[PDB]
Structures are given as structure tokens and as C-alpha cells.
Design a protein around this ligand. Structure first.
Ligand SMILES: CCCCCCCCCCCCCCCCCC(=O)OC[C@H](COP(=O)([O-])OCC[N+](C)(C)C)OC(=O)CCCCCCCCCCCCCCCCC
Ligand SMILES: CCCCCCCCCCCCCCCCCC(=O)OC[C@H](COP(=O)([O-])OCC[N+](C)(C)C)OC(=O)CCCCCCCCCCCCCCCCC
Ligand SMILES: *[C@@H]1O[C@H](CO)[C@@H](O[C@@H]2O[C@H](CO)[C@@H](O)[C@H](O)[C@H]2NC(C)=O)[C@H](O)[C@H]1NC(C)=O
Ligand SMILES: *[C@@H]1O[C@H](CO)[C@@H](O[C@@H]2O[C@H](CO)[C@@H](O)[C@H](O)[C@H]2NC(C)=O)[C@H](O)[C@H]1NC(C)=O
Ligand SMILES: NC(=O)OC[C@@H]1N=C(N)N2CCC(O)(O)[C@@]23N=C(N)N[C@@H]13
Ligand SMILES: *[C@@H]1O[C@H](CO)[C@@H](O)[C@H](O)[C@H]1NC(C)=O
Ligand SMILES: *[C@@H]1O[C@H](CO)[C@@H](O)[C@H](O)[C@H]1NC(C)=O
Ligand SMILES: *[C@@H]1O[C@H](CO)[C@@H](O)[C@H](O)[C@H]1NC(C)=O
Lengths: 1323, 57
């Protein structure tokens, strides 16, 4: 429309074309003062070959719509017929743009190899090529002085800034401005245009960045309000180290004047237990970690964890520690360092910053990327609507072909292939010679069946229709690679023909339809995946060469900063090491790589690792989700009857009462908080043991009597067929069995008492919002079970490949305590045992396929994956010492697993819950299933009309105080000038820092007395002018509660002052008043479409977390039974363990995001060097369980971390996508709330009518999309508002008329007869 | 008498780290400061290829 008129705007004397290239075309036109036969209405081919090429380009240039041709159009802004015409003829050639693309793919190869004496002689020639296409593409057309010239499009604007870089770094600059030569890799972004279909991803990548302008400014505001809030309550907290007492009567000085400051603040008087790097923190609080005997916790005494980079004592460093907590990378080392120093009640800080930080504001980013991809795909499908619119030989062939026709012979090959995969998945390291003999002779049988079958199939069908389909030609390649295996085993040079017997696992794809339908879509949409895979590996190539040029020589120059003076295993010192350190930051991990970057260099590491996290992980990984949502969207028996049906009629009335089933709910919640008090301190609290004993006897009487009431109400048939009453019946059977055992001897089993926790799910599904949340976990439970089974299959190919590469390796010769020996000291098992050492195995290994799956879940969740990589790179042979880094190309096994098994398989769980919640919310809102795409936009505009009323304006009272306070208590000037002072009350709190001075806190305390009294005047004016209406606004009671607690802190200071007006709680209330900004701006329509989408989801995002707390309640009670006496190893210690119910929730909140389940697994599944339970004495024994530890964690990660944490993103993407479908098709919820705001400016009463005169000022004062400008009186006659008597109109009949004006002027034929048909259907 | 790396068993004795076939190992060998028994295990070498060797237990 607008560009369609702009297409004709170029046509008349503005900018005439000069050439044309559409389907092998090379034309030559001019600016109609001396043109040469372009075209007007003929399609000629006679005179010019440029016209003869334009005859085939008469239909092909305008084939799809308009975009096949490209014209060097300048209208001869400088006379276009010199030799300039020849450079036009060269630039339009397809060989020219094919030549520059080749010299870029060559110049990328000379970046990844290290430099030499012939680099400067070869960096000079490629600079000479790229300066010719910038002087040809300007001397053919180009200035900055007119349209289409040369600097209009960004692609020619990428030649010019990079070629100016190449001429700066060659003249004067040798050491200064040397960082600019790193950016000559940016020219390699041109080669996106070589893969077909590049426009639907790059424009979607471009629409995503230009649509996050409204979110980054909202996320920069919420990080600011958290960096201030974390600075006030955690400054100096992270430097608390236990310092030994000053020695009584010892070898130091007498007077504790300055010798107390030389004794303390000497590094040999801090604790540092047993060869550790950092020093352990402690706290004076109650659940915080304490110090040994004879020491003490002290604050100060410099040294801050992670080289000084993990802190909260400056606004700069508090802004970084909050940002890694929104990111969730290695955040449990911050979570565990702030609960150890400040005690366990500070989990309430981390719940808020994880809820509002990474479950909301990182799922709004997912929603913008999903809506930006689906806009550029659905745009690119209108273009698909335009392209589319002898005699013994033939004897046996009936007999051999008789058996290969049936499903019986297809069953027989299907039994063998499931059996052949089993013999590949049973071999391992150190296997018996009889057990290995079976697997060799099974290979001679299974290859023999595959040869008989192929030949039989070829004879039966034909030797020329056999190669028709793709399965019979895939089968024949297997028989080729298998018949080489039986001949190349006596050669025994290389076992690479032994690798392609792993390729026959994919024979199972043609048999069972779940894996068949999964393969079918990856081939139907192969063009979508290869584009995003190429863009992702092209960004990692750009960032690898930038990182290697910037940070490369720092890792070699001053290695001395690193611990033990060695390189890290992850550094920017080579290409293959720069690639993997950028690739593991796209996987999430960037903070640990940034510490040792910034340790060895400058501040410039910080803009690098944020830009590779923001581009790599928040955009590219969310396009990769967004592909999946579009491709994977699919005697006298009547007289005994008055006794039996007499009880039956009464007992059915108990189950229907609202007081009975509220009584039974109240029992089950009281009796399970009793179950959270059975901890390790229970066998010394003698009164609590007897309470929890006689409750287990009343509960058996309560469960049997309730069961008889249900069986006398719902009957036998509907009891035992329902799924909830089977939870009832198992628990009653579980408590009859504990009563049987304890009458007759045996003490009760403590894992059958814990089954009444599973009875808290019946009253949980009756909470007001929880019916939508629990209905999508039940509807999607068969859809996850297909994705798990398809997930097990592709993981199995990587596992029975990882066994064949890594089994028998990962052994090493280790010293007394833990230190791994070196090569040239020992180099095999012979040299290790002879020197009386030990030859240990790694904990996570690849010996058999059971050990493979645990070690491969480590690298799929990215938690424990550095040690398995550090084992896989060092391994060389079965009984040799691992030399470090000697096998560096085993990284390619892990890149191909993380792509095909983390970015793709584990992101299908997000794809399911987005699909199912979108259609279960529609059922729960009462809407019609499969109504329409646009008719529901019109229903939500009528259903929001019917349920809206005006709002009473505040009645001003009449006194000399009351009239002149209310004048200033209502002004929009006064609301702003009391808001700009709240902001300056909090920006002053961001310049507090640790150990500032005494003179600096003399200004900032007196400045905190000026603002504390302006907010007292404001709180008097807004109550003197607003009698009881002040207390109705939630941002006024918080403003009221601050001035009360802050006047009580200054006056009446020393009342008792034990702890009443503690200055932490006043700091929390200064920062909390900035939240009025969320109800402040409305001119930012891009932000209010995210604040309104947020508010409509908070009720159903409180229910997703309240289901998560119940699941965390269930495993915290089972975890205190199983894993309470475990000895201290790795992550379970004296502070974070499973002893009390407090310590269990601290760990299970950490493990809900899978943060560090590798260290929790290493303790709770440890069966070596443990004592035994001597039950005839006591001592339950400090020994973990391998089998119970796997089933506890692996079931937990597939509940919280895969289908409950992924439930927040399914809710955010549903409501955000609805709100944007109301700004582009009509009437958001903030549009109605403005009509009733301008309604009370004309009707300041409880009435609902106005005067018919005032209608011309309604429709002029409000904002669009409801305005009608002047003269409006001919727009109101046709509008037909029903005038009631005495010149009064009703607000409904004006609101309905302003609805039907909007739908008419936007939706032409789809809203006239539809938006009026729906309103008649209700009224 | 623990004189050297020495092994006790029958004739045809195959020592440690020598290829065996289904019971052609020895009873017990003094190899690394102790007397250790020996079975005929099969290790891993390359894809899907086992190489069988007398190993200690
Ligand atoms: C949902 C329900 C989840 C529960 C499923 C987990 C069952 C695990 C049972 C533990 C059995 C171990 C017994 C034992 O002694 O150890 C033997 C040995 C112990 O070491 P060993 O090798 O010396 O014997 O190890 C094993 O055999 C157990 C390995 C099994 C690992 C399975 C992890 C699953 C991977 C996730 C897949 C998700 C795809 C997406
Ligand atoms: C079809 C499956 C192809 C896998 C066959 C490759 C087997 C192999 O040896 O690769 C190791 C080699 C490693 O190189 P290498 O084994 O030659 O290392 C040399 C070791 N030194 C220096 C000590 C002599 O190549 C790979 O690692 C390929 C990674 C596998 C790709 C993942 C499959 C999807
Ligand atoms: C933790 O509490 C102890 C005492 O409960 C505090 O120790 C005192 O510290 C001051 C100076 O910091 C010394 O002059 C006192 O002699 C110490 N007294 C004792 C009994 O140790 C310690 O400061 C507190 N640590 C904090 C708040 O971080
Ligand atoms: C470790 O090797 C040493 C030799 O380097 C062995 O030395 C023995 O040491 C003990 C004392 O601990 C002496 O009584 C013996 O005479 C030494 N020889 C022998 C053959 O035992 C020692 O045996 C090895 N370590 C162990 C634990 O056996
Ligand atoms: N080692 C490893 O897996 O590296 C990844 C990353 N780095 C650590 N130092 N971690 C502490 C242990 C851990 O789980 O591995 C991890 N904790 C988180 N949240 N990610 C891990
Ligand atoms: C303590 O004072 C002594 C001088 O008596 C000085 O040598 C030492 O460096 C001081 N301690 C510290 C930690 O500076
Ligand atoms: C304290 O500092 C002094 C510096 O002279 C040093 O000699 C000593 O080892 C340190 N530790 C103690 C316990 O004095
Ligand atoms: C353990 O390693 C430490 C070095 O961290 C070393 O000093 C010690 O000798 C080793 N063995 C021990 C602690 O007995």
C-alpha cells in the first residue's frame, strides 16, 4: 500500500533504472533522455540481446511478485554514459558476486591458521581485491547524496567501514589502536547469503532486535532496583572470615590497641582448612555456618571470593552479581555463599530475583523471538500460494516373492533388528571370554541374515525396482559396509568399517510409527534447520576470531596471575580453544570464563561475554525453539431395603456437605506439617516422639472410617474406577499394614508412613486457579512419554558410540590424597603399581551403557560436563597414563551431542507445554474450541463491554483545610513532582559503598533527612485532602508505612531499641516505592503491552509455583528419610544437607533449576568407605545408595527442571501473544480503562448518563484508537446512539458504538457483519 | 620364594599381560608385591573389537 505507492513514486522522473538481472539477465537502460529500448508493452527480443534477455525476463522478473530484478538506478545523477557504463555492466554479472564470495571463504581459512612470514604478503592481496569492488561499485553508481546511491543499504555499508579499517592498520598504527584489526572478520557476515532461504531467518533475527527495545529498558530498570536492593543488605557480607582469638598471655604484645589489628589481618590467622583455594565464610546468625572452637567471625579483613569479583559492596559489582543470577550460570556458588554468611532466611531474596528475573523476564524474550519468527514465516507462505497457485526364473519369483510380501517376514526382520541393537549395547570393558564369544558369533549370524534378505528382496521385486524407494537402498548400503567388515578384520589396519555397523540402528525407523513420524518432519523442514545451524556456527566463528585477537596474547604474556602459573584448560590462545570457550558461553556458562579473562587483562572482557550471551543464548537459542513450535505443532427384599438404602441415603449427604470435605482437608494439612518435624533431632525430643506416635494411630482410624463413608456414598463401581480414590485406597492399605506389624511385633516401616503426603493433591486441584495448571500436566502426560522414548533412542546411538571410544580409558595413576601424577614419571599401570601408587578410575565414565547414560546426562544439562570433557580429551589408550590435551578433536563428539541432544531433544518439552496450555486455557475460559483466529478477537471485545461500569470521582469536602489540600492532592503536576523525588531518593542509595568514609556518610545522612520530611508533608496533604480514599491505593499504604517507620527511627529513637526499627527493614521500604513507575508511564505503549500481559498472568503464575512448593514438599520429606545420615562429601556438608526440613528446602530449591546436581549425586550415591548400620546397637550408618540416589535425582529433574520450570514459559507466551493480538486487531484492556477515565471528567457522580450536548467533547478529549475529530456531528448521526428521554444517553450504548467504529475502519468485510452479529447474540 | 616375577600353576603357563583362550591362564602370579589370581578377561580396543589377555583380579 504505502510501499506500493512508493514503488510508483520512483517511476515518474525520480530515479530511473539502468540495468536488469533476473534469471540470467544483463541489461543496459538509461534515464529516458537517451534510453535504449527497455519496455512499455511488447516484451521484445529483436534488437538487443539485453532485450532478448528481457523477453525471458518479461515474465520471470515479475514472476512471484516483483523482486527478481536488481537495478543500478541513479537517474544519471552525474551523466551515466562514460566508462562508468562499463562498470555497471561488470557489477551486474553473476560471476562478480560469485568471485567476492569465494575470496571471503578463502580469507577465513587464513585467519584460523597461525601467522607466518607470508601472512603480510597475503593479507596485502586480499585487501587489494576488496578495495576494487568498493571503487567499482561507486564508479558505477554511488554517493551519499541521492537515493539508491551506495551507502543506502547496510551491505555496502559493511564493505566501507571494514576496508577503512584495513587502511588504518597499515600506515601509522603499530601498537596503538591495534585492537581494530580484529574487526576485519565482520566482512564474513556476507556469506549468510549463500545458503538458500536466508531471508526468512535474517529478517526474523533483525525484527527480534528491533522489537526488544521495550524490554531491555524494562530489564535495565528491574536489575537497577535489585542491584540497589542487594547493595543495601549484602555489602561487606561476602568478606566474613573466622579469625582466631588474640592470644591470652602468649607471644604477642600486651595492649589490644594496634596489636589486635596486626594479629587479625595477618593471613596466617584465618582458617583455610585443608589445602583449599578460597577461605570459608561464616556468620553470627543461627543457620549460618560457624567457625571451629577458638575462632570467631569478623567482617572486613580483605579478600573477596573469586579473585574479588563476586561481591555486593559496590553498585558496579552488585549489578554484575544480580545479572548472573538472572542468567542462572553457576549461581549456586552465589546462593551458597550468601546463605552461609547471612543465614538461611535470605532465601526470600533469591526466590524473588529468580521469579521476577528468570521465569518472567527471560520468557518475555522467548515470546518476542517466537512472535518475530512466526511473523516472517507466515509472511513467506503467501509466496508459496503464488508458486503453487526365464521360465524357471519367473517360476521361483512367485514363490520367493510369496514370503517377502507379508507382515510376517517384516516381523522377522523387526525381531532381529531389536535384537541386533541389544548385542551392540551389551559390550563393555573387562568382559568374560564366554560372554564375548556370544557377541562375535552373533555378528556372523546377524550379518548373514541381512545378506540373505537383501538378495531375496532384489530377486523377488526386481533388480531395478528395488532401488526405487529409500529404505531398500538404505538397506543395501548396510550389506555393503557389513561385507567389508568380514573381510577387513584380518587386515586390522583401522577399524573404521567397524563404525558403520552403528548405522543399522536407524533401521528401526521404518517399523514403529512414533520414531517414523519424528524422522518425517526433520526431512520435510530441512531448509529451516540448516539455516539456523549455519547462522549459529557463523556467529561462533565471528566471536572466536575477535576473542583470539583481543585476548590472545594476555593468556601467554602474564600467566603468573593464574593459580600454579599454568594455562587454564579453556583459553583464548588458539582457534580451537577460542571456539570452545565461545561455544560454552552459548550453552550458558560465561562467568567463570570471564573471571580469568579479566584477571589477566582489562575491563574489555565484560562487553565481550555479555554480547555472546545475549546474541548466542537469548536470541539464537530462542529461534531454535521457535522452529520447533511451527514444525512440531502436531424374603421381602424391599423391607431390608429401608435399612441398607437408609444408611446409603444419609452417608451420601455427608460427602456433599461443604463442612465435611473442608474438615477432611484441614486434617490432612495439619497432620503433614507434623511430618516435617521428623528430623535428626527427633530422638532426643521425648514429647514430640509421643505426639507423632499417637497421631499415626488416630490417622488409621480416620482413614478407614473415611473409606467406609466413600464406599457408602459413591458405591463400589465408581470408587475403584476413579483415579483419585485409588490414591485413597493405597494409603488406607498402607496404614492397615503398619497397624498389623506393630501389634504383632515388628517396628513400623518409615517409608509407608510418608504416603499421606500424596493425599495433598486432591485439595490442591480445587484451588481457584489450579484447574488450568493441573489439566495441562494430565493432558500432556502421554505426549511427554513419546518424547522420552524418542529421546532414549537418539541418546542410545551416542551412548554406544561413547562406549566404543572411551571405555577402558579415564583411568589414571593418582597420588596419596588426590593429586594426579604426571607423564614421564609414570606412563602405564606397570609404572604405577611398581612405585606403590594407586590406579584409580574416574567417577563418571563410559565403561558400559549404564555408565554412559549418567555421564551423558551430565553434559546434556551442562552440570558436571567439564570433568568428562577433561577426561575425554586426555585419553589415548586403555592402559596408559592420560597426557593432557593430546586428543583435542574429541570435542567434536560433544558438539554433535549438545546440538542433537540438548538444543533439540530437551527443548521439545517446552514445545509440548506451549501447545497444550494454549488449548486448555481456551477450554477453561469457556470458549468454543476451534472457533476462529479472528472471531475470538471480537468476542473478547464484546465480553469486556458487558462487564464494565464507571468509577465514582472522589467527593471533595468543603472546609478551609479540605478544599485547598484536595486542589493540590489531585494535580498531575503534583503526582510527577512527588515521583521525581522518589527516584532521587533511590539513586542516592546507589552511591553507598563499603568503607566509604565518615565525612561521606555525613552528607548522605543529612540528605536522608531532607527527603524524609518532604515525604511527611506529602503524606499529610494526601490525607487532609483525601479522607479515606488515600488508603485504597496500594502504593499509598506503602508510602504511609515508610514515613511511620522512618519518623519513628529519628524521633523516639531510643525507645527500647533492642530490635524494632532495624535499619534493614527501612532500606527495603525506600527501594520498594519505585514500583509506582510501573503504574506511571502510558506514553510507552511498547512497555504497557508487557506490563498488562504480566498482570493477567500473575494469578496463574502463582499457581505454577504453588504446585512447585508442594513437589518440593514431597521430596524434602522423602529426602530426610533416605539421605539424612550421609557422610560429608563434595556438596553435602555441615550447612547444606538433608538433616532438618530447613536444610532440605535450601537444597531442593537449588536443584529445581538443576544447578549442581552433580555434587549432590556424588554424596548421596557414595558406597565406598562407609560404615554399616548396626541395628542391634544403634548407629544408622553413614552410607549412601547408588540405586536409590539415581531414582531420586533423575526423577526430580524430569519433574521440576523439565516440566514445571518449562511451565512458566508456556504461560508467558500464551498471554503475551494474546495482548499483541489486541493492539494489531483492536481494543486492549487499557483502552477500556481510559474511556471510563474520561467518562468521569464529564460525569463525576454515581450516575451512568450524561448530556447529549457533551458527546462532541467525549470523542475529542480521549486518545486513539477511539477518537473522532472535528467535525464529528456527521459521524454521530450515522452512529445511531439510542437517545433516552430528557436528552440523556447511556454509557453502554456509546461504548458499543465506539467499539463498532473501530472494527469497521480496520476489518472491512470480516467485522461489519460479525462484530454486530456477536453483540446481538448476547444482548 | 618371591624371587622375581614368578608364577605357580601347571605346564603351558601363560603369564600376565599375555593373550589367552578360555582357561589357558595360570593359577596365581607374584607380580606387584603380592600374590594375585589370574583370569582370562577380554578388554576393549577400537570399535566393537575385544582383545583377550590374562588379567589379575
Ligand atoms: C520417571 C522415573 C525415573 C526413574 C528411572 C531411573 C531408574 C534407575 C535405577 C537405578 C539402577 C542402578 C542399580 C545399580 O546397582 O547400579 C548399576 C551400575 C553401578 O555401577 P557399575 O557399572 O559398577 O555396576 O550402574 C547402572 O547400571 C545404572 C545406570 C542407569 C542410569 C540411567 C540414567 C537415565 C538417563 C536419563 C534419560 C532421560 C532422557 C531424556
Ligand atoms: C559413522 C560414524 C563415524 C565415526 C568413526 C570415527 C572413529 C574415530 O576414530 O574418530 C576419532 C578421530 C579423532 O582423531 P584421532 O583418533 O586420529 O587422534 C589421534 C591420536 N593421536 C595423536 C594420539 C595419534 O576423529 C574423531 O574424533 C571424530 C569424532 C566423531 C564424530 C561424531 C559422530 C557423529
Ligand atoms: C559477630 O559477633 C561477635 C560477638 O558476638 C562480634 O565480635 C566483637 O567484635 C568487636 C569488633 O568487631 C570486638 O571489639 C569485640 O571484642 C568482639 N566481641 C566478641 C565477644 O567476639 C563480631 O563483630 C560479629 N561479627 C559481625 C557482626 O560480622
Ligand atoms: C613399596 O615398595 C617398597 C620398596 O620400594 C617395599 O619395601 C619394603 O619395605 C618394608 C618396610 O615398609 C620392608 O620391611 C621390606 O623389606 C621392603 N621390601 C619388601 C619386599 O617388602 C614395600 O613392600 C612396598 N610397599 C608395600 C606396602 O608393600
Ligand atoms: N563442572 C561443570 O559442570 O561446569 C559447569 C558449571 N561450572 C561449575 N563450576 N559448576 C559447579 C558444579 C557444577 O554443577 O558443575 C557447576 N554448577 C553450575 N550451576 N554449572 C556448573
Ligand atoms: C603489623 O605490624 C608490623 C609492625 O609491627 C608490620 O611488620 C606488619 O606488616 C603489620 N601487619 C600487616 C598485616 O601489615
Ligand atoms: C604475622 O606477620 C609477621 C610479619 O613479620 C610474620 O612474620 C608472621 O609469620 C605472621 N603470622 C604470625 C602468626 O605472626
Ligand atoms: C596432599 O597434597 C598437599 C598439597 O596440596 C601436599 O602438601 C601433601 O603432602 C599431600 N598429602 C598429604 C596432605 O598428606
Amino acid at each position: 500500500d504505502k510501499g506500493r505507492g512508493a514503488n510508483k513514486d520512483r517511476d515518474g522522473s525520480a530515479h530511473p533504472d539502468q540495468a536488469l538481472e533476473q534469471g540470467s539477465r544483463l541489461p543496459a537502460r538509461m534515464r529516458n533522455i537517451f534510453p535504449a529500448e527497455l519496455a512499455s508493452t511488447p516484451l521484445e527480443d529483436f534488437d538487443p540481446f539485453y532485450k532478448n534477455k528481457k523477453t525471458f525476463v518479461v515474465v520471470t522478473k515479475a514472476g512471484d511478485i516483483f523482486r527478481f530484478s536488481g537495478e543500478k538506478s541513479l537517474w544519471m545523477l552525474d551523466p551515466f554514459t562514460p566508462i562508468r557504463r562499463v562498470a555497471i555492466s561488470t557489477m551486474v554479472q553473476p560471476i562478480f558476486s560469485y568471485f567476492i564470495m569465494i575470496t571471503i571463504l578463502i580469507h577465513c581459512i587464513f585467519m584460523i591458521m597461525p601467522a607466518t612470514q607470508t601472512t603480510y604478503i597475503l593479507e596485502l592481496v586480499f585487501l587489494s581485491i576488496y578495495t576494487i569492488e568498493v571503487v567499482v561499485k561507486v564508479l558505477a553508481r554511488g554517493f551519499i547524496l541521492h537515493p539508491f546511491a551506495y551507502l543506502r543499504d547496510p551491505w555496502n555499508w559493511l564493505d566501507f567501514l571494514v576496508t577503512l579499517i584495513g587502511y588504518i592498520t597499515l600506515v601509522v598504527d603499530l601498537g596503538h589502536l591495534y585492537a581494530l584489526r580484529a574487526f576485519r572478520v565482520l566482512r564474513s557476515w556476507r556469506t549468510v547469503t549463500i545458503v538458500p532461504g536466508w531471508r526468512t531467518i535474517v529478517d526474523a533475527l533483525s525484527l527480534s532486535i528491533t522489537s526488544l527495545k521495550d524490554l531491555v529498558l524494562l530489564l535495565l530498570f528491574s536489575l537497577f532496583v535489585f542491584a540497589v536492593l542487594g547493595l543495601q543488605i549484602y555489602m561487606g557480607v561476602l568478606t566474613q572470615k573466622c579469625v582466631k582469638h588474640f592470644p591470652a598471655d602468649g607471644s604477642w604484645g600486651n595492649f589490644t590497641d594496634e596489636r589486635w589489628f596486626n594479629y587479625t589481618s595477618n593471613s596466617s590467622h584465618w582458617y583455610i582448612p585443608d589445602d583449599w583455594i578460597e577461605y570459608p565464610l561464616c556468620g553470627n546468625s543461627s543457620g549460618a555456618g560457624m567457625c571451629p572452637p577458638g575462632y570467631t567471625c569478623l567482617q572486613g579483613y580483605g579478600g573477596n571470593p573469586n579473585y574479588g569479583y563476586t561481591s555486593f559492596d559496590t553498585f558496579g559489582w552488585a549489578f554484575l552479581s544480580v545479572f548472573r543470577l538472572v542468567t542462572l550460570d553457576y549461581w549456586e556458588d552465589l546462593y551458597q555463599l550468601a546463605l552461609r554468611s547471612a543465614g538461611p532466611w535470605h532465601i526470600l531474596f533469591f526466590i524473588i530475583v529468580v521469579f521476577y528475573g528468570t521465569f518472567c523476564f527471560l520468557n518475555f524474550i522467548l515470546a518476542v523471538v517466537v512472535m518475530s519468527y512466526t511473523h516472517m514465516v507466515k509472511r513467506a507462505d503467501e509466496e508459496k500460494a503464488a508458486e503453487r497457485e526365464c521360465v524357471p526364473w519367473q517360476k521361483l519369483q512367485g514363490a520367493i516373492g510369496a514370503v517377502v510380501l507379508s507382515p510376517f517376514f517384516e516381523l522377522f526382520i523387526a525381531v532381529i533388528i531389536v535384537l541386533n541393537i541389544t548385542f551392540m549395547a551389551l559390550d563393555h570393558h573387562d568382559m568374560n571370554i564366554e560372554f564375548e564369544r556370544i557377541l562375535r558369533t552373533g555378528n556372523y549370524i546377524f550379518t548373514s541374515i541381512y545378506i540373505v534378505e537383501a538378495v531375496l528382496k532384489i530377486i523377488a521385486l526386481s533388480p531395478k525396482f528395488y532401488f526405487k524407494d529409500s529404505w531398500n537402498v538404505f538397506d543395501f548400503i548396510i550389506v555393503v559396509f557389513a561385507i567389508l567388515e568380514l573381510g577387513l578384520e584380518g587386515v586390522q589396519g583401522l577399524s573404521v568399517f567397524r563404525s558403520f555397523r552403528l548405522l543399522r540402528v536407524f533401521r528401526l525407523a521404518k517399523f514403529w510409527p512414533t520414531l517414523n513420524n519424528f524422522m518425517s518432519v526433520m526431512t520435510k523442514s530441512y531448509g529451516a534447520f540448516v539455516n539456523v545451524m549455519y547462522v549459529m556456527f557463523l556467529l561462533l566463528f565471528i566471536f572466536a576470531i575477535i576473542g583470539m585477537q583481543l585476548f590472545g596474547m594476555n593468556y601467554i604474556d602474564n600467566m603468573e596471575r593464574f593459580p600454579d602459573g599454568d594455562l587454564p584448560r579453556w583459553n583464548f590462545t588458539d582457534f580451537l580453544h577460542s571456539f570452545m570457550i565461545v561455544f560454552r558461553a552459548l550453552c550458558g556458562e560465561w562467568i567463570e570464563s570471564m573471571w580469568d579473562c579479566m584477571l589477566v587483562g582489562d575491563w574489555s572482557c565484560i562487553p565481550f561475554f555479555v554480547a555472546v550471551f545475549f546474541v548466542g543464548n537469548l536470541v539464537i537459542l530462542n529461534l531454535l525453539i521457535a522452529l520447533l513450535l511451527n514444525n512440531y505443532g502436531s424374603a421381602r427384599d424391599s423391607s431390608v431395603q429401608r435399612m441398607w438404602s437408609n444408611i446409603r441415603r444419609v452417608c451420601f449427604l455427608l460427602a456433599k456437605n461443604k463442612y465435611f470435605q473442608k474438615f477432611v482437608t484441614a486434617v490432612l494439612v495439619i497432620t503433614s506439617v507434623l511430618l516435617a518435624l521428623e528430623d535428626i533431632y527427633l530422638p532426643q525430643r521425648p514429647v514430640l516422639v509421643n505426639i507423632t506416635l499417637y497421631v499415626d494411630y488416630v490417622l488409621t482410624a480416620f482413614f478407614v472410617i473415611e473409606m467406609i463413608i466413600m464406599l457408602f456414598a459413591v458405591g463400589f463401581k465408581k470408587y475403584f474406577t476413579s483415579k483419585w480414590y485409588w490414591l485413597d485406597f493405597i494409603v488406607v492399605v498402607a496404614y492397615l499394614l503398619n497397624f498389623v506389624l506393630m501389634c504383632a511385633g515388628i517396628e513400623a516401616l518409615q517409608t509407608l508412613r510418608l504416603l499421606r503426603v500424596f493425599r495433598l493433591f486432591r485439595p490442591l486441584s480445587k484451588v481457584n486457579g489450579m484447574q488450568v495448571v493441573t489439566s495441562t500436566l494430565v493432558e500432556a502426560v502421554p505426549h511427554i512419554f513419546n518424547v522420552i522414548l524418542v529421546g532414549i533412542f537418539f541418546w542410545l546411538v551416542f551412548a554406544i558410540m561413547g562406549v566404543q571410544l572411551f571405555a577402558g580409558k579415564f583411568y589414571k595413576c593418582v597420588d596419596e590424597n588426590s593429586t594426579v601424577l604426571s607423564h614421564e614419571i609414570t606412563m602405564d599401570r606397570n609404572d604405577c603399581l611398581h612405585e606403590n601408587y594407586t590406579w584409580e578410575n574416574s567417577p563418571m565414565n563410559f565403561d558400559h551403557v549404564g555408565n554412559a547414560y549418567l555421564s551423558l546426562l551430565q553434559v546434556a544439562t551442562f552440570k558436571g560436563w567439564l570433568q568428562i570433557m577433561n577426561d575425554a580429551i586426555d585419553s589415548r589408550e586403555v592402559h596408559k597414563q592420560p597426557i593432557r590435551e593430546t586428543n583435542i578433536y574429541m570435542y567434536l563428539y560433544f558438539i554433535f551431542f549438545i546440538v542433537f541432544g540438548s538444543f533439540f531433544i530437551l527443548k521439545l518439552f517446552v514445545c509440548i507445554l506451549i501447545d497444550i496450555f494454549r488449548q486448555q486455557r481456551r477450554k477453561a475460559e469457556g470458549l468454543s474450541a476451534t472457533d476462529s483466529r479472528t472471531q475470538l478477537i471480537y468476542r473478547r471485545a464484546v465480553m469486556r463491554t458487558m462487564s464494565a461500569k464507571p468509577v465514582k470521582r472522589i467527593p471533595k469536602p468543603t472546609c478551609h483545610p479540605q478544599s485547598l489540600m484536595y486542589d493540590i492532592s489531585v494535580n498531575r503536576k503534583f503526582e510527577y513532582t512527588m515521583m521525581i523525588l522518589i527516584i532521587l531518593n533511590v539513586a542516592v542509595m546507589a552511591i553507598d559503598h563499603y568503607g566509604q568514609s565518615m565525612e561521606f556518610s555525613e552528607v548522605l545522612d543529612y540528605l536522608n533527612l531532607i527527603f524524609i520530611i518532604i515525604f511527611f508533608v506529602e503524606c499529610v496533604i494526601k490525607v487532609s485532602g483525601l479522607r479515606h480514599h488515600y488508603f485504597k491505593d496500594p502504593w499509598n499504604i506503602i508510602d504511609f508505612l515508610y514515613v511511620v517507620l522512618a519518623i519513628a527511627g529519628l524521633m523516639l529513637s531510643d525507645v527500647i531499641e533492642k530490635y524494632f526499627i532495624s535499619p534493614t527493614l527501612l532500606r527495603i521500604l525506600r527501594i520498594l516505592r519505585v514500583g509506582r513507575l510501573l503504574r506511571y508511564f502510558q506514553s510507552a505503549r511498547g512497555m504497557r503491552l508487557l506490563l498488562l500481559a504480566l498482570r493477567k498472568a500473575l494469578r496463574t503464575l502463582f499457581n505454577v509455583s504453588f504446585l512447585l512448593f508442594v513437589i518440593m514438599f514431597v521430596y524434602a520429606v522423602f529426602g530426610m528419610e533416605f539421605f539424612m545420615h550421609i557422610r560429608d562429601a563434595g556438596a553435602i556438608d555441615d550447612v547444606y544437607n538433608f538433616k532438618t526440613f530447613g536444610q532440605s528446602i535450601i537444597l531442593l530449591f537449588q536443584l529445581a533449576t538443576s544447578a549442581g546436581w552433580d555434587g549432590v549425586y556424588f554424596a548421596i550415591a557414595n558406597e565406598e568407605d562407609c560404615r554399616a548400620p548396626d541395628h542391634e546397637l544403634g548407629y544408622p550408618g553413614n552410607c549412601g545408595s547408588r540405586a536409590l540416589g539415581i531414582a531420586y535425582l533423575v526423577s526430580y529433574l524430569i519433574i521440576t527442571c523439565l516440566v514445571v520450570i518449562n511451565m512458566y514459559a508456556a504461560v508467558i507466551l500464551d498471554y503475551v501473544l494474546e495482548v499483541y493480538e489486541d493492539s494489531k486487531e483492536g481494543l486492549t484492556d487499557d483502552d477500556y480503562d481510559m474511556f471510563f477515565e474520561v467518562w468521569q471528567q464529564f460525569d463525576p457522580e454515581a450516575t451512568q448518563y450524561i448530556r447529549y450536548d457533551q458527546l462532541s467533547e467525549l470523542l475529542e478529549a480521549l486518545q486513539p484508537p477511539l477518537q473522532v475529530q472535528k467535525p464529528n456531528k456527521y459521524k454521530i448521526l450515522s452512529m445511531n446512539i439510542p437517545i433516552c428521554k430528557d436528552d440523556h444517553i447511556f454509557y453502554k450504548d456509546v461504548l458499543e458504538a465506539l467499539v463498532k467504529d473501530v472494527f469497521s475502519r480496520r476489518g472491512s468485510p470480516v467485522e461489519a457483519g460479525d462484530v454486530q452479529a456477536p453483540n446481538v447474540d448476547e444482548a | 620364594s618371591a624371587k622375581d616375577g614368578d608364577v605357580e600353576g601347571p605346564a603351558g603357563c601363560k603369564k600376565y599381560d599375555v593373550e589367552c583362550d578360555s582357561g589357558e591362564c595360570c593359577q596365581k602370579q607374584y607380580l606387584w608385591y603380592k600374590w594375585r589370581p589370574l583370569d582370562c578377561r577380554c578388554l576393549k580396543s577400537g570399535f566393537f573389537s575385544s582383545k583377550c589377555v590374562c588379567r589379575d583380579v
